[PDB]
Coordinates of N, CA and C and ligand atoms in Angstrom, one line a residue:
Chain A
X1 N 131.8 83.5 125.4 CA 132.7 82.3 126.2 C 134.2 82.2 126.5
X2 N 134.8 82.3 127.4 CA 136.3 82.2 127.5 C 136.8 80.7 127.7
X3 N 137.9 80.2 127.1 CA 138.1 79.1 127.2 C 138.0 77.9 128.9
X4 N 138.0 78.9 129.8 CA 137.1 78.5 131.2 C 136.0 77.9 130.9
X5 N 135.1 78.8 130.4 CA 133.2 78.5 130.0 C 133.3 77.0 128.9
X6 N 134.3 77.1 127.8 CA 134.0 76.0 127.2 C 134.5 74.4 128.0
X7 N 135.6 74.5 128.5 CA 136.1 73.4 129.5 C 134.9 72.8 130.5
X8 N 134.3 73.8 130.8 CA 132.5 73.8 131.6 C 132.3 73.0 130.5
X9 N 132.0 73.6 129.7 CA 130.8 72.8 128.6 C 131.4 71.6 128.4
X10 N 132.5 71.4 127.8 CA 133.1 69.7 127.6 C 133.0 68.6 128.9
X11 N 133.2 69.2 130.0 CA 132.6 68.4 131.8 C 131.5 68.0 131.8
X12 N 130.4 69.1 131.5 CA 128.9 68.8 131.3 C 128.7 68.0 130.4
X13 N 129.1 68.1 129.8 CA 128.0 67.5 128.6 C 128.9 66.1 128.2
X14 N 129.7 65.9 128.5 CA 130.6 64.6 129.0 C 129.8 63.7 130.2
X15 N 129.9 64.5 131.6 CA 128.0 63.6 132.5 C 126.8 63.6 131.9
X16 N 126.4 64.5 130.8 CA 125.0 63.8 130.7 C 125.7 63.0 130.2
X17 N 126.7 62.2 128.7 CA 126.2 61.4 127.7 C 126.3 60.2 129.3
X18 N 127.4 60.6 129.6 CA 127.2 59.0 130.7 C 125.7 58.3 131.3
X19 N 124.8 59.5 131.6 CA 124.2 59.7 132.5 C 122.8 59.6 131.6
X20 N 123.2 59.3 130.3 CA 122.0 59.6 128.9 C 121.5 58.0 128.7
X21 N 120.1 58.8 128.3 CA 118.7 57.8 128.2 C 118.8 57.4 126.9
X22 N 119.2 58.1 125.6 CA 118.5 57.7 124.8 C 119.7 58.4 123.5
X23 N 119.8 58.0 122.2 CA 119.9 59.1 121.2 C 120.5 59.8 120.8
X24 N 119.3 60.7 120.9 CA 119.3 61.6 121.2 C 119.5 62.5 122.2
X25 N 119.7 62.5 123.4 CA 120.4 62.6 124.7 C 121.9 62.9 124.3
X26 N 123.0 61.8 123.4 CA 124.1 61.4 123.4 C 124.2 62.6 122.3
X27 N 123.6 62.8 121.6 CA 123.9 63.5 120.2 C 124.4 65.0 120.2
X28 N 123.0 65.4 121.1 CA 122.4 67.0 122.1 C 124.5 67.0 122.0
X29 N 124.2 66.6 123.5 CA 125.9 67.1 124.0 C 127.1 66.6 123.0
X30 N 126.8 66.1 122.5 CA 128.3 65.5 121.4 C 127.9 66.8 120.5
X31 N 127.4 67.6 119.7 CA 127.4 68.2 119.2 C 127.3 69.2 120.0
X32 N 127.3 69.8 121.0 CA 128.0 71.3 121.9 C 129.3 71.0 122.6
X33 N 129.7 69.9 122.6 CA 131.2 69.2 123.3 C 132.0 69.8 121.9
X34 N 131.6 69.6 120.7 CA 132.4 69.8 119.4 C 133.0 71.2 118.9
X35 N 131.7 71.9 119.2 CA 131.4 73.8 119.2 C 132.5 74.4 120.6
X36 N 132.3 74.0 121.3 CA 132.9 73.8 122.9 C 134.4 73.7 122.6
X37 N 134.7 72.8 122.3 CA 136.4 72.1 121.5 C 136.8 73.3 120.7
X38 N 136.2 73.8 119.1 CA 136.4 74.4 118.6 C 137.0 75.7 119.0
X39 N 135.8 76.4 120.1 CA 136.3 77.9 120.8 C 137.3 77.5 121.4
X40 N 137.3 76.5 122.3 CA 138.4 76.9 123.0 C 140.0 76.6 122.5
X41 N 139.9 76.1 121.1 CA 141.4 75.8 120.1 C 141.5 76.9 119.9
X42 N 141.0 78.4 119.8 CA 141.6 79.7 119.5 C 142.2 79.9 120.3
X43 N 141.7 79.7 121.7 CA 142.5 80.6 122.8 C 144.1 80.5 123.3
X44 N 144.8 81.2 124.2 CA 145.8 81.1 124.6 C 145.4 80.7 126.4
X45 N 146.1 79.2 126.7 CA 145.3 78.7 127.7 C 146.8 79.6 128.7
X46 N 146.2 80.3 130.3 CA 147.0 80.7 130.9 C 148.5 80.3 131.3
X47 N 148.6 79.1 130.7 CA 149.9 78.2 131.2 C 151.2 79.0 130.4
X48 N 150.6 78.8 129.2 CA 151.7 79.7 128.5 C 151.3 80.6 127.9
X49 N 150.6 81.5 128.7 CA 150.6 83.3 128.5 C 151.6 83.1 129.1
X50 N 152.7 84.8 128.4 CA 153.7 85.2 127.9 C 155.3 84.4 127.9
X51 N 154.6 83.1 127.8 CA 156.0 82.0 127.1 C 155.7 82.4 125.5
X52 N 155.3 82.7 124.8 CA 155.5 83.2 123.2 C 155.9 84.7 122.7
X53 N 156.5 84.6 122.2 CA 157.2 86.5 121.7 C 156.1 86.9 121.1
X54 N 155.9 88.4 121.4 CA 155.0 89.0 120.8 C 156.1 89.8 119.4
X55 N 154.8 89.9 118.2 CA 155.1 90.5 117.2 C 155.0 92.0 117.7
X56 N 155.8 92.8 116.3 CA 155.6 94.2 117.0 C 155.0 95.3 116.9
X57 N 153.7 94.4 116.4 CA 151.9 95.1 117.0 C 151.8 94.4 118.2
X58 N 152.1 93.6 118.7 CA 151.3 93.1 119.8 C 151.8 93.7 120.8
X59 N 153.7 94.0 120.5 CA 154.0 94.8 121.9 C 153.3 96.1 121.7
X60 N 153.1 96.8 120.2 CA 152.5 98.0 120.9 C 151.3 97.6 121.1
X61 N 150.3 97.3 120.3 CA 149.1 96.5 121.7 C 149.0 96.6 123.1
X62 N 150.6 96.1 123.5 CA 150.2 95.9 125.2 C 150.6 97.2 125.4
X63 N 151.7 98.2 125.2 CA 152.4 99.3 125.0 C 151.3 100.7 125.1
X64 N 149.6 100.2 125.1 CA 148.5 101.1 125.0 C 148.1 101.2 126.4
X65 N 148.7 99.7 126.7 CA 147.6 100.0 128.7 C 148.9 100.4 129.5
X66 N 150.0 99.9 128.7 CA 150.9 101.3 129.7 C 150.9 102.5 130.1
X67 N 150.3 102.6 129.2 CA 150.3 104.1 128.7 C 148.8 104.2 129.7
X68 N 148.1 103.2 129.3 CA 146.6 103.4 130.1 C 146.9 103.7 131.7
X69 N 147.4 103.0 132.3 CA 147.9 102.4 133.6 C 148.8 103.3 134.7
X70 N 150.1 104.4 133.7 CA 150.1 106.0 133.6 C 149.0 106.6 134.4
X71 N 148.2 106.9 133.4 CA 147.5 107.6 133.4 C 146.2 107.5 134.4
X72 N 145.7 106.3 134.6 CA 145.5 106.2 135.8 C 145.9 105.8 137.1
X73 N 147.2 105.9 137.0 CA 148.3 105.9 138.4 C 147.8 107.3 138.5
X74 N 147.9 108.4 138.5 CA 147.9 110.0 137.8 C 147.0 110.5 138.5
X75 N 145.6 109.9 138.5 CA 144.5 110.1 139.0 C 143.9 109.3 139.4
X76 N 144.4 108.1 140.4 CA 144.4 107.8 141.5 C 145.3 108.2 142.9
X77 N 146.0 108.9 142.5 CA 147.2 109.8 143.4 C 145.9 111.1 144.2
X78 N 145.7 111.2 142.6 CA 144.9 112.9 143.8 C 143.5 112.4 144.0
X79 N 142.9 110.8 143.8 CA 141.4 110.5 144.8 C 142.1 109.8 145.7
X80 N 143.4 109.7 146.0 CA 143.8 109.0 148.0 C 144.0 110.2 148.5
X81 N 144.3 111.7 147.7 CA 144.3 112.6 148.4 C 142.8 113.5 148.7
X82 N 142.1 113.2 147.4 CA 140.7 113.1 147.8 C 140.1 114.8 147.1
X83 N 141.0 114.6 146.4 CA 140.7 115.9 145.5 C 139.7 114.7 143.9
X84 N 138.7 115.5 144.5 CA 137.7 114.5 143.6 C 137.5 114.8 142.1
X85 N 137.3 116.2 142.0 CA 137.3 117.2 140.9 C 138.6 116.3 139.6
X86 N 139.5 117.1 140.7 CA 140.7 116.8 139.8 C 141.2 115.2 139.1
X87 N 140.9 114.8 140.2 CA 140.6 113.0 139.5 C 140.0 112.8 138.3
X88 N 138.4 113.0 138.3 CA 137.8 113.0 137.8 C 138.3 114.0 136.1
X89 N 138.8 115.3 136.1 CA 139.2 114.9 134.8 C 140.4 114.4 134.3
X90 N 141.5 114.2 135.7 CA 142.4 113.0 134.8 C 142.7 111.5 134.1
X91 N 140.6 111.2 134.5 CA 140.3 110.5 134.0 C 139.7 110.5 132.7
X92 N 139.4 112.0 132.4 CA 139.0 112.4 131.3 C 139.7 112.3 130.0
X93 N 141.3 112.4 130.9 CA 142.2 112.5 129.7 C 142.8 111.0 128.9
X94 N 142.2 109.9 129.9 CA 142.4 108.6 129.7 C 141.5 108.2 127.7
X95 N 140.8 109.2 127.6 CA 140.0 108.9 126.7 C 141.1 108.8 125.1
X96 N 141.9 109.6 125.3 CA 142.7 109.8 124.2 C 143.8 108.9 124.2
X97 N 143.9 107.8 125.1 CA 144.5 106.7 125.1 C 143.5 105.7 124.9
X98 N 142.5 105.5 125.4 CA 141.6 104.5 124.6 C 141.2 104.5 123.1
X99 N 141.0 105.7 122.5 CA 140.6 106.2 121.2 C 141.8 105.6 120.4
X100 N 143.1 106.4 120.6 CA 144.3 106.2 119.9 C 144.4 104.2 119.6
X101 N 144.2 102.9 120.4 CA 144.0 102.1 120.8 C 143.5 101.8 119.5
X102 N 142.0 102.0 120.0 CA 140.9 101.7 119.4 C 141.0 101.9 117.7
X103 N 141.5 103.1 117.0 CA 141.5 103.6 116.0 C 143.0 102.6 115.8
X104 N 143.5 102.5 115.6 CA 144.8 101.5 115.2 C 144.6 99.7 115.7
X105 N 143.6 99.0 116.6 CA 143.5 97.9 116.7 C 141.7 97.2 117.1
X106 N 141.3 98.1 116.8 CA 139.7 97.3 116.7 C 138.9 97.2 115.5
Chain B
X1 N 138.2 86.5 132.9 CA 138.2 87.9 131.9 C 138.6 88.3 130.9
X2 N 137.7 88.1 130.0 CA 138.0 88.1 128.7 C 138.3 89.6 127.8
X3 N 139.3 90.1 127.3 CA 139.0 91.1 126.8 C 137.8 92.0 126.5
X4 N 137.2 91.4 126.2 CA 135.9 92.2 125.8 C 134.8 92.2 127.0
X5 N 135.4 91.5 128.5 CA 134.9 92.1 129.7 C 135.4 92.9 130.1
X6 N 136.7 92.4 129.9 CA 137.9 94.0 130.8 C 137.1 95.8 129.8
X7 N 137.4 96.0 128.3 CA 137.0 96.9 128.3 C 135.5 97.4 128.9
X8 N 134.3 96.3 129.0 CA 133.2 96.6 129.3 C 133.3 97.3 131.0
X9 N 134.4 96.4 131.8 CA 134.5 97.3 132.9 C 135.4 98.5 132.5
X10 N 136.1 98.6 131.7 CA 136.8 100.5 132.0 C 135.7 101.2 131.4
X11 N 135.2 101.0 130.3 CA 133.9 101.6 129.8 C 133.0 102.0 131.0
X12 N 132.1 101.1 131.7 CA 131.2 101.1 132.8 C 132.2 101.9 134.3
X13 N 133.1 101.9 134.3 CA 133.8 102.7 135.7 C 134.3 104.1 135.0
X14 N 134.7 104.6 134.4 CA 134.7 105.7 133.2 C 133.7 106.0 133.6
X15 N 132.5 106.2 133.0 CA 131.1 106.6 133.4 C 130.9 106.9 134.9
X16 N 131.0 106.1 135.8 CA 131.4 105.8 137.0 C 132.0 107.2 137.8
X17 N 132.9 107.5 137.2 CA 134.2 108.6 137.6 C 133.3 109.6 137.1
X18 N 132.7 109.9 136.3 CA 132.2 110.9 135.6 C 130.6 111.5 136.4
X19 N 130.0 110.5 136.9 CA 128.8 110.8 137.7 C 129.2 110.1 139.4
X20 N 130.4 110.3 139.6 CA 131.0 109.8 141.0 C 130.4 111.0 142.0
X21 N 130.4 110.2 143.5 CA 129.1 111.2 144.4 C 130.5 111.3 145.1
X22 N 131.4 110.7 145.4 CA 132.9 111.2 146.6 C 134.1 109.9 145.8
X23 N 135.3 110.5 146.6 CA 136.5 110.0 146.7 C 136.1 108.4 146.6
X24 N 135.8 108.4 147.8 CA 135.3 106.4 147.8 C 135.7 105.7 146.8
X25 N 134.5 106.2 146.2 CA 133.7 105.5 144.6 C 134.3 106.0 143.5
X26 N 135.7 107.3 143.5 CA 136.0 107.3 142.2 C 137.3 106.4 142.5
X27 N 138.1 106.3 144.0 CA 139.3 105.1 144.1 C 138.8 104.1 143.8
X28 N 137.7 103.5 144.0 CA 136.8 102.0 143.4 C 136.9 102.0 142.2
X29 N 136.2 103.0 141.5 CA 136.5 102.6 139.6 C 138.0 102.4 139.9
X30 N 139.0 104.0 139.4 CA 140.0 103.8 139.2 C 140.5 102.6 139.6
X31 N 141.0 101.8 140.5 CA 141.4 100.9 141.4 C 140.7 99.1 140.3
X32 N 139.7 99.5 140.3 CA 139.3 98.2 138.9 C 139.7 98.4 137.5
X33 N 139.4 99.3 137.2 CA 140.1 100.1 136.1 C 141.8 99.7 135.5
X34 N 142.3 99.9 136.7 CA 143.9 99.4 136.5 C 144.0 98.1 136.6
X35 N 143.3 97.8 137.2 CA 143.0 95.7 137.6 C 142.7 95.6 135.7
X36 N 141.7 96.1 135.1 CA 141.1 95.1 133.9 C 142.0 95.9 132.9
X37 N 142.4 96.7 132.6 CA 143.5 97.7 132.1 C 144.8 96.6 131.7
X38 N 145.0 95.8 133.4 CA 146.5 94.9 133.0 C 146.0 93.5 132.6
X39 N 144.6 93.0 133.0 CA 144.0 91.9 132.5 C 144.1 92.0 130.9
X40 N 143.5 93.3 130.5 CA 143.3 93.2 128.7 C 144.6 93.1 128.5
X41 N 145.6 93.5 128.9 CA 146.7 93.8 128.4 C 147.7 92.4 127.9
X42 N 147.3 91.2 128.5 CA 147.6 89.8 128.4 C 146.9 89.2 127.0
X43 N 145.9 90.0 126.5 CA 144.9 88.9 125.8 C 145.5 89.2 124.4
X44 N 145.3 88.6 124.1 CA 145.5 89.2 121.6 C 144.1 89.5 121.1
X45 N 143.7 90.8 120.9 CA 143.0 91.3 120.1 C 142.0 90.6 119.3
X46 N 141.1 90.9 118.7 CA 141.3 89.4 117.6 C 141.4 90.1 116.1
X47 N 141.9 91.3 116.0 CA 142.6 92.1 114.7 C 144.2 91.7 114.8
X48 N 144.5 90.7 115.7 CA 145.8 90.5 115.4 C 146.2 88.7 115.8
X49 N 144.9 88.2 115.8 CA 144.6 86.4 116.0 C 144.9 86.0 114.9
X50 N 145.1 86.1 113.7 CA 145.4 85.3 112.6 C 146.8 86.2 112.3
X51 N 147.7 86.7 112.8 CA 148.9 87.8 112.7 C 150.1 87.0 113.0
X52 N 150.0 86.2 114.5 CA 150.9 86.0 115.1 C 150.8 84.1 114.8
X53 N 152.4 83.9 114.7 CA 153.0 82.5 114.9 C 152.7 82.1 116.2
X54 N 152.2 80.8 115.9 CA 152.1 80.1 117.3 C 153.2 78.8 117.6
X55 N 153.7 79.0 118.7 CA 154.4 78.7 119.0 C 154.5 76.9 118.9
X56 N 156.0 76.3 119.3 CA 155.1 74.9 119.2 C 154.6 74.0 120.4
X57 N 154.7 74.7 121.1 CA 153.7 74.4 122.4 C 152.6 74.7 122.0
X58 N 151.4 76.4 121.2 CA 150.5 76.5 120.9 C 150.1 75.7 120.2
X59 N 151.0 74.8 118.9 CA 150.6 74.2 117.7 C 150.4 73.2 118.7
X60 N 150.8 72.7 119.6 CA 150.5 71.2 120.0 C 149.2 71.2 120.9
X61 N 148.9 72.4 121.9 CA 148.0 72.6 122.2 C 146.5 73.0 121.1
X62 N 146.9 73.6 120.4 CA 145.5 73.1 118.9 C 145.5 72.0 118.7
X63 N 146.5 71.1 118.2 CA 146.0 70.6 117.5 C 145.2 69.3 119.0
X64 N 145.7 69.5 120.2 CA 144.4 68.1 121.3 C 143.1 68.8 120.9
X65 N 142.7 69.7 120.3 CA 141.1 69.9 120.1 C 141.0 69.1 118.7
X66 N 141.6 69.2 117.7 CA 141.9 68.2 116.1 C 141.5 66.7 116.7
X67 N 142.0 66.7 118.3 CA 142.2 64.7 118.3 C 140.8 65.0 119.0
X68 N 140.5 65.9 119.6 CA 139.4 65.7 120.2 C 138.1 65.9 119.5
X69 N 137.5 66.9 118.2 CA 137.3 66.6 117.4 C 136.7 65.6 116.6
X70 N 138.1 64.9 116.1 CA 138.1 63.8 115.5 C 137.0 62.5 116.5
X71 N 137.6 62.6 118.0 CA 136.2 61.5 118.7 C 135.2 61.7 118.9
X72 N 134.7 63.0 118.7 CA 133.7 63.4 119.4 C 132.2 62.8 117.4
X73 N 133.6 62.9 116.9 CA 132.9 62.8 115.5 C 132.7 61.7 115.6
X74 N 133.3 60.9 116.3 CA 132.9 59.2 115.7 C 132.1 58.5 116.8
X75 N 131.9 59.7 117.4 CA 130.8 59.2 118.7 C 129.3 59.1 118.2
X76 N 129.4 60.8 117.4 CA 128.8 61.4 116.9 C 128.1 60.2 115.6
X77 N 128.8 59.9 114.4 CA 128.5 58.7 113.7 C 127.5 57.7 114.4
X78 N 128.0 57.0 116.2 CA 127.5 55.5 115.8 C 126.1 56.8 116.8
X79 N 126.0 57.4 117.4 CA 124.5 58.3 118.1 C 123.3 58.7 116.7
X80 N 124.1 59.0 115.7 CA 123.0 58.5 114.7 C 122.8 57.6 113.9
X81 N 123.6 56.8 114.2 CA 122.8 55.5 113.7 C 121.9 54.3 114.9
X82 N 121.8 55.4 116.3 CA 121.2 54.8 117.3 C 121.8 53.7 117.8
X83 N 122.9 54.0 118.2 CA 124.2 53.1 119.0 C 124.2 53.9 120.3
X84 N 123.4 53.5 121.2 CA 123.4 54.8 122.5 C 124.2 53.9 123.4
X85 N 125.2 52.7 123.6 CA 125.9 52.2 124.0 C 126.9 52.6 123.8
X86 N 127.2 51.9 122.5 CA 128.7 52.4 122.1 C 128.9 53.9 121.4
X87 N 127.7 54.9 121.5 CA 128.1 56.2 121.4 C 128.8 56.2 123.0
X88 N 128.2 56.0 124.0 CA 128.3 56.4 125.5 C 130.0 55.6 125.5
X89 N 130.1 54.5 125.3 CA 131.8 53.7 125.2 C 132.6 55.0 124.3
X90 N 132.7 55.5 123.3 CA 133.2 56.5 122.1 C 133.7 57.2 122.8
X91 N 132.4 58.5 124.2 CA 132.6 59.2 124.6 C 133.5 58.9 125.9
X92 N 133.6 58.1 126.3 CA 134.3 57.5 127.6 C 135.9 57.9 127.1
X93 N 136.0 57.0 125.9 CA 137.7 57.6 125.1 C 138.2 59.1 124.9
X94 N 137.0 59.5 125.3 CA 138.2 61.8 124.7 C 138.8 61.8 125.9
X95 N 138.2 60.9 127.2 CA 139.0 61.4 128.9 C 140.4 61.0 128.3
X96 N 140.9 60.3 127.3 CA 142.3 60.7 127.5 C 143.0 61.4 127.3
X97 N 142.1 62.1 125.8 CA 142.4 62.6 125.8 C 142.6 64.3 126.2
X98 N 141.4 64.5 127.1 CA 141.1 65.6 127.8 C 143.0 65.7 128.8
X99 N 142.5 64.1 129.7 CA 143.6 64.3 130.1 C 145.7 64.7 129.8
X100 N 145.5 64.4 128.8 CA 146.6 64.4 128.5 C 147.1 65.8 128.1
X101 N 146.2 66.3 127.6 CA 146.7 68.1 127.5 C 146.3 69.1 128.6
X102 N 145.4 68.5 129.2 CA 145.8 68.5 131.0 C 146.9 68.6 131.5
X103 N 147.9 67.5 131.3 CA 148.7 67.1 132.2 C 150.1 67.7 131.5
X104 N 150.0 68.6 130.5 CA 150.4 69.3 129.5 C 150.6 70.5 129.8
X105 N 149.1 71.2 130.4 CA 148.7 72.8 130.1 C 148.1 73.3 130.9
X106 N 147.5 72.6 131.5 CA 146.6 73.2 132.6 C 147.7 73.3 133.9
Ligands
LIG1 C1 144.5 70.1 124.0 C2 143.8 70.9 125.4 C3 142.2 70.3 126.3 C4 141.7 69.3 126.0 C5 141.6 68.8 124.9 C6 140.6 69.7 127.1 N1 140.7 70.3 127.6 FE1 140.2 70.8 130.2 N2 141.8 72.6 130.2 C7 142.1 73.0 128.9 C8 143.0 74.2 129.8 C9 144.7 74.6 128.9 C10 142.6 74.0 131.3 C11 143.0 75.4 132.0 C12 142.0 76.4 131.5 C13 142.4 77.5 132.7 O1 143.2 77.4 133.7 O2 141.7 78.8 132.4 C14 141.0 72.8 130.9 C15 140.5 72.7 132.4 C16 139.0 72.4 132.1 C17 138.7 71.8 133.2 C18 138.4 73.2 134.5 C19 137.1 73.9 134.6 C20 137.7 75.0 134.1 O3 135.9 75.2 133.7 O4 137.8 75.4 133.0 C21 137.3 71.4 133.2 C22 136.6 70.2 134.2 C23 138.2 70.5 131.9 N3 138.9 71.7 131.8 C24 137.2 69.2 131.4 C25 137.7 68.7 129.8 C26 137.0 67.8 129.4 C27 135.7 67.4 129.8 C28 137.2 67.6 128.9 C29 137.4 66.6 127.1 C30 135.9 66.5 127.3 C31 138.7 68.6 128.0 N4 138.7 69.3 129.3 C32 139.7 68.8 126.8 C33 142.7 72.0 128.3 C34 141.7 71.3 127.4
LIG2 C1 145.9 99.9 124.0 C2 144.5 99.3 123.3 C3 143.0 99.8 124.3 C4 143.1 100.3 125.1 C5 143.8 101.2 126.0 C6 141.4 100.6 125.5 N1 141.0 99.8 124.5 FE1 138.9 99.2 124.5 N2 139.0 98.0 123.3 C7 140.6 97.7 122.1 C8 140.1 96.3 121.4 C9 141.1 95.8 121.0 C10 138.8 96.1 121.6 C11 138.2 95.0 120.9 C12 137.6 93.9 121.8 C13 137.2 92.7 121.1 O1 137.1 93.2 120.3 O2 137.2 92.0 121.5 C14 138.3 97.0 123.1 C15 137.0 97.0 122.5 C16 136.1 98.0 123.6 C17 134.6 98.7 123.4 C18 133.7 97.5 122.7 C19 132.9 96.7 124.3 C20 133.4 95.5 125.3 O3 133.3 95.6 125.9 O4 134.9 95.3 123.9 C21 135.1 99.6 124.7 C22 133.4 100.1 125.1 C23 135.8 99.8 124.3 N3 136.8 99.2 124.1 C24 136.0 101.2 125.6 C25 137.6 101.0 126.2 C26 137.9 102.3 127.1 C27 136.6 103.1 127.7 C28 139.1 102.6 127.4 C29 139.6 103.5 128.0 C30 140.0 103.8 129.5 C31 140.0 101.2 126.0 N4 138.5 101.6 126.0 C32 141.3 101.2 126.3 C33 141.5 98.0 122.8 C34 141.7 98.9 123.9
LIG3 ZN1 134.2 82.5 122.3
LIG4 ZN1 133.5 87.6 126.1
LIG5 ZN1 132.1 83.3 130.9
LIG6 ZN1 132.7 81.8 133.3
LIG7 ZN1 141.1 87.6 133.0
LIG8 ZN1 132.4 87.4 131.0
LIG9 ZN1 129.5 92.0 129.4

């Protein structure tokens, strides 16, 4: 689940509690709210994306995608020309980049 | 989409390109890979989670959930005693915390 999912879980269960019939129901809803709150707590909300400094490691991580996008663009130009086979070969070269990042950060 | 979703989109579309029928298909796959790469780029990968400082803003953001969990726990104790009505009233007080965070970070 992502932050958005967790908020949906919070909102849904709050409404359940408002319409709740008995203690068991309220307990069940509150328990799920607690877990969702703690999962949401670990996320970076969209409004604070790009507002924090990146570590050297985080900078290198993000740089891997700049490499990948450059290679995707190379393949994309071939696809737009209609060179199916050469676009498929260019895609295969992406795997080098995929693997390099994984080895460091997965 | 979170990082894990984006990687699934990358992996799926890479395989599509390998088995692709035509130029339009390869183009569609590559376009989605480019967007997924750029969406993934904004994430913090799990291996670098506990390795980065939180900004003052990020610290305050996370603190909001500690407040919420404390209030959920207050309501939960009432639910476990069987005080349905008082547990429902305690849940309503959560909304103050919900709203405060939203006003700052949503
Ligand atoms: C500490 C911060 C914080 C608290 C506490 C919090 N929220 Fe949110 N909530 C957010 C942020 C940030 C967003 C925007 C997320 C986004 O843009 O993807 C959000 C979005 C939402 C949304 C929009 C729809 C969705 O699925 O994302 C709803 C509904 C929501 N919150 C409900 C609640 C409810 C109900 C509570 C309390 C029981 C609550 N929130 C408590 C930070 C918080
Ligand atoms: C610059 C970094 C980086 C690049 C580039 C990258 N990956 Fe990943 N990939 C990751 C990380 C980090 C994870 C771990 C995700 C997690 O735990 O949330 C991951 C996870 C995955 C997974 C595991 C399943 C999933 O959905 O998370 C697959 C499959 C995957 N990547 C495929 C690819 C493919 C295919 C490419 C190239 C087209 C690629 N990756 C490029 C960093 C990268
Ligand atoms: Zn999660
Ligand atoms: Zn996920
Ligand atoms: Zn989801
Ligand atoms: Zn969702
Ligand atoms: Zn996304
Ligand atoms: Zn998803
Ligand atoms: Zn998935």
